[model samples]
Target: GVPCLCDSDGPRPRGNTLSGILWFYPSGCPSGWHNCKAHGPNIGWCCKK
Candidate 1:
């Protein structure tokens, strides 16, 4: 099944945001999220393979 990869949330300790995306696999890819790119200091996005 195709998983969701939407990292959306508020602030947390040590500069972190909890998003529903994390609950799922690395961008829902079987291998995982690769070549990750940061959206900011806390959160980021990546490619799935």
Candidate 2:
């Protein structure tokens, strides 16, 4: 996992404004990411592993 500066349209997360790198997780984060609530509860940067 990496520091994916993402934002969510509804529930699913998407990349930063112009960037293109959408991330998906069944419940929590994908695998190696940490601090699911880095910025907010549903939006922020997921720290890399």
Candidate 3:
């Protein structure tokens, strides 16, 4: 495995961080690097492939 960063089968936020918004990725992060969904429902898989 490349190594899982986050975990999210679909797409969702981890939660509000107080400082800013939070997010979740049950499927883990992308190959090396990726971006996050700043807006939208569940922010589906942030940069969902």
Candidate 4:
């Protein structure tokens, strides 16, 4: 899994990071991937499994 920018409520693809831009809320990450971090209130960077 790699890091990518995605919507907090968007689909959790095989490899992509969930962003909080559209929605300023916390959302769970995809399988094999940890929660987002270090980016901004609207966006964050996810780590690989």
Candidate 5:
């Protein structure tokens, strides 16, 4: 098995740091050192924008 780093999965800073956007990839992260499509729906998941 490989390790996963989901740092970019959250949304960018919107001026404030109260809350952050999140995109869920039920399939989970990619295979080791690989980048996953955490931001599938632009600003957020299927409901954003």
Candidate 6:
């Protein structure tokens, strides 16, 4: 069988901030808050992806 963990990606977020979607996966936030996009500090470049 296989196994999994809650924060299973391996390394926890080095730390997150409202500075745009710097990561590509769940950053330990709520389900809908998957990425720090749109409403982050870097508003212009963040909404690109």
Local distance difference test values of all predictions, in order: 0.32, 0.38, 0.36, 0.41, 0.33, 0.30
Please tell me which predicted candidate would have the highest lDDT against the true structure.
4
TM-score of each: 0.17, 0.26, 0.20, 0.23, 0.16, 0.18
What are the per-residue Cα lDDT tens digits for candidate 4 across 1-41?
Answer: 33445434355554434332222335534555554444433
Better model by lDDT: candidate 3 vs candidate 4: 4
Worst 10 residues of 3 by lDDT: 1-10
Candidate 4 residue runs with Cα over 4 Å from true position: 1-26, 36-41
lDDT of 3: 0.36
Candidate ranking under TM-score, highest first, comes to 2, 4, 3, 6, 1, 5
lDDT of model 5, residue 25: 39
Backbone Cα, N, C clashes tallied per candidate: 0, 0, 7, 2, 0, 0
Model 3 Cα lDDT, one tens digit per residue, 1-49? 1212333323444432221222355553355435334432254334332
Runs off by more than 4 Å, candidate 5: 1-15, 26-49
Error of 1 at 22 (Å): 7.4
Scored against the true structure, residue 43 in model 6 reaches a CA lDDT of: 20
Per-residue lDDT tens digits of candidate 1, residues 1-49? 2222333333323323332232233343235444222332233332223
Q: How close is candidate 4 to the true structure, as a TM-score?
A: 0.23
**lDDT of model 6, residue 12:** 38
Candidate 5, residues 1-49, lDDT tens digits: the string is 2222233535634412222233343444222323333444342332121
lDDT of 4: 0.41
List runs of model 1 lying over 4 Å from the truth: 1-31, 38-41, 44-49
Error of 6 at 7 (Å): 19
* Candidate 3 C-alpha error for residue 7, in Å: 20
Candidates arranged by lDDT, highest first: 4, 2, 3, 5, 1, 6
**Each model's RMSD to truth, in Å?**
10.3, 9.1, 11.2, 9.3, 11.5, 12.6
